[PDB]
Structure formats: C-alpha cells, structure tokens
C-alpha cells in the first residue's frame, strides 16, 4: 500500500523553496480513495484523471509537498509565471500529473505569526521544471559585492510567509501535494488496484 | 543614490508606437523588480506593465498585447514599446522601482513623460475628493477598500504639483525614509487613514493609496488637500 499517508498527512510540510520530494515505487495505490479522502480545494489533473489512475502502473511517480498562501496556488499548474512558478517550484509546460491543495489555516497559522515558511523572492532567472534552489547566498541587487553581509541592494534571498490565523485567505497557508506520473520502456511499479 | 529617468514621449497618431526608456543608477536594472505606472486625467493612477528580478513580465489588462516591457544589460536601461496607440493611453508614464510584497508598491519613481495620442481588482475609494484648509491645521483622509487588506498592504503616496509621487506610508502605519513625522497612518481590514497633524505649505499636494494586497494593484483616486 502507498505510503500517501506519510506525504497527505505529515505533520509538518516543507517550505516551497526547499520543496519535499517523495518517490513512489513498488506500491499499490487507490487514487479514486486518495480523492474522497478529504476536503481539496483544489484537485487538478492534467493528461490522467484519478478513475483511469487506478488502471495502470506508472514507473516515476513522485509526490512533492510544500506550503504557499491562498494566492499562490494558480501558480502550481503548467505555463504559469509569478514568484513560486519562477523562483520555487515549476511545473513543466506539458506536465502529467495532479496537484492537489487545501487551505491548512488550522495547523500552519499561528497567533503572532508563524514565519516558518519561506519562499524565494529574489533570484536572476528563472527555474527548470522540477529545480529546487535551496541556496541562501545574499542576493547581489547592486553592482557592488555583498560578501555575507545584508544591506542595502544585497538582499537575504528568501522571504517569510507571516501566517496569522485572521489573515484572509489569499494570505493564509495552504498545504500543496505534486504527483507526477510517466509511462517508460522502464519497469512500472506504483500500480492501481 | 538611487536615480529614474525617462526619455521618450510626445505626440504621437492613433495606433502609432512608441518606446520609453528610463535609465537607472543605484542599482542593476536586470537584477531587479521594475514598473511602469502612468496617470491619466480620468483614469488617475494606473499600474501599466512589470518585469521581475528574473525576467517574467506582467500586464494590465489595459494594455496587453500592445505594450511590452524589457530591459538592456548593458545600458541599465528599463525600455516600454508601446504599439497601437490609443486616445486612453494618454497619460504621464512614470517608471517606478518595486517593493516586491504582495502586488507591490513603489518606494523610488522616475520624473514622468507625457505621451499624447491625438485624435476582478480591489477598489480603493478615497474621501473627500477636495480639501481646503490653513496651515497649523490637522486634516484625516479617508480610504476605503472594497474587500479586506488583510495584513496592512495599503501605502500612501504624496504627490506635490508637475512631480512625481512619492512614497510617505507602507505597510498602513510605517512611514517611509526621511517622512515628517506629523504624516501618521493607520486603520486596518477596510478603512485606512492618513493624518496630516499640523499642515504647512509644502503639503499641498494630491495623497493617494495604494493597495498591494490583491493583483493587479490598484491606487485611490487621490483627495487633494490646499493650504
């Protein structure tokens, strides 16, 4: 049975600029079960549908997981721009897969503000599809070289989400899981019932 | 430190085309997030186009398809070609430096070119529209949003007579480098205030917000305050 438990359900998600990865392999999964199973705001799947998932075995199936805010969601999906798509978690133009979201204002919000999660604001281009970029070198704005030191046009790169619980909801965290699929001349182990 | 200046402009035929350039110092052009924002008698103040620090560009709706953003490496210079005029995209056009939160606000502006052509977003409303009042006086005006800011996203521009505006208010409350104190902010969910404690001369002026909650940005519509 596929450890989905493990990915949907963990306590503690990572930050979106250094994104979790899990592969799936050598498991049986329910996808029509993994759909009903909670409440998802969002549900998307490009190229497969969670009824034909259950049909086939998949040789690369992976789950990424992390945490954005409410608006940020629409970034997750093929062809779109904006800080995530560019600078934390890309998503190939033609991708096969899922992405699944639901508001987590309960569990990653906190009163005075929980700024635990991090995103990546600053950054010269942008991402491949499936990069992380987990370096934290201060970002050099100016022409004059930073050296480790924050100030003026040199820029610690990343940024804090500040989740408090009475944020509306473009700004409140919601937890994100990335499953992608591929059918290869390899061996199929993730399989549906 | 920090310097924006355009050139470019003028008067140009319906459905002609036109570029802008504004030359920075203080920074490297390609390595930052950068906007164009214009101003039209009707219209006011009106976000245009923007590029990010790694190089994604991004429109008002307005405008899409018809403008285009860039920039030049070598020169440190910020470029918006402009084709298919129309008489709505008469306006002074201001090339401004991001503050990357949110949908961003603009802490530096450039001077502002006039061009001429012949021939879902929150709504800040902003009250009164006119204000006439002596020096020594304190004076509140109002902003009204049409949906919640929910983390204080809303700025406060001045904008003195045939110049650019300038930031006084970011984050509601914070005011900005080198602000007289007497300019205080405040208010939160969907009613902001900006209170001028003992007013002067030099503050005759237009004031705008500025939400930065929600994309696109979008500015009040100005309350002009006279001395």
């Known amino acids: 049975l596929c450890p989905f438990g493990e990915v949907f359900n963990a306590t503690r998600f990572a930050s979106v600029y250094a994104w979790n990865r899990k592969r799936i392999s050598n498991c049986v999964a329910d996808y029509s079960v993994l759909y009903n199973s909670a409440s998802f705001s969002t549900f998307k799947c490009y190229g497969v549908s969670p009824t034909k998932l259950n049909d086939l075995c998949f040789t690369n199936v992976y789950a990424d997981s992390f945490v954005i805010r409410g608006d940020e969601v629409r970034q997750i999906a093929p062809g779109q721009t904006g800080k995530i798509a560019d600078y934390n978690y890309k998503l190939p133009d033609d991708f096969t897969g899922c992405v699944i979201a639901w508001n987590s204002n309960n569990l990653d919000s906190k009163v005075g503000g929980n700024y635990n999660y991090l995103y990546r604001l600053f950054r010269k281009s942008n991402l491949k599809p499936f990069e992380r970029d987990i370096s934290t070198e201060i970002y050099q704005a100016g022409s004059t070289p930073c050296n480790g030191v924050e100030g003026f046009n040199c820029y610690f790169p990343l940024q804090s989400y500040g989740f408090q619980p009475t944020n509306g909801v473009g700004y409140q965290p919601y937890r994100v899981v990335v499953l992608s699929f591929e059918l290869l001349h390899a061996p199929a182990t993730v399989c549906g019932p | 430190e920090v310097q924006l200046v355009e050139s470019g402009g003028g008067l140009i035929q319906p459905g002609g085309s036109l570029r802008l350039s504004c030359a920075a110092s203080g920074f490297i052009v390609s390595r930052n997030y950068m906007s164009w924002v214009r101003q039209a008698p009707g219209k006011g103040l009106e976000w245009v186009s923007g590029?990010?620090?790694?190089?994604?560009?991004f429109y008002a709706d307005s405008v899409k398809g018809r403008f285009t953003i860039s920039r030049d490496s070598s020169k440190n210079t910020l470029y918006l070609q402009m084709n298919s005029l129309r008489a709505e995209d008469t306006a002074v056009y201001y090339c401004?430096?991001?503050?990357?939160?949110?949908?961003?606000?603009?802490?530096?502006w450039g001077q502002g070119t006039l061009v001429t052509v012949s021939s879902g977003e929150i709504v800040l409303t902003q009250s009164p529209g006119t204000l006439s009042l002596s020096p020594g006086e304190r004076v509140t005006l109002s902003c009204r949003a049409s949906?919640?800011?929910?983390?204080?996203?809303l700025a406060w521009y001045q904008q003195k007579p045939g110049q650019a505006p300038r930031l006084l208010i970011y984050?509601?409350?914070s005011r900005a480098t080198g602000i007289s104190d007497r300019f205080s902010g405040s208010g939160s969910g969907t009613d902001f205030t900006l209170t001028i404690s003992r007013l002067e001369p030099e503050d005759f002026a237009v004031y705008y917000c500025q939400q930065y909650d929600s994309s696109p940005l979008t500015f009040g519509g100005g309350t002009k305050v006279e001395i």
């Open positions: 590029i990010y620090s790694g190089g994604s560009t």
């Open positions: 949906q919640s800011v929910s983390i204080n996203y």
């Open positions: 984050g509601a409350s």
């Open positions: 401004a430096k991001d503050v990357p939160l949110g949908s961003h606000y603009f802490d530096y």
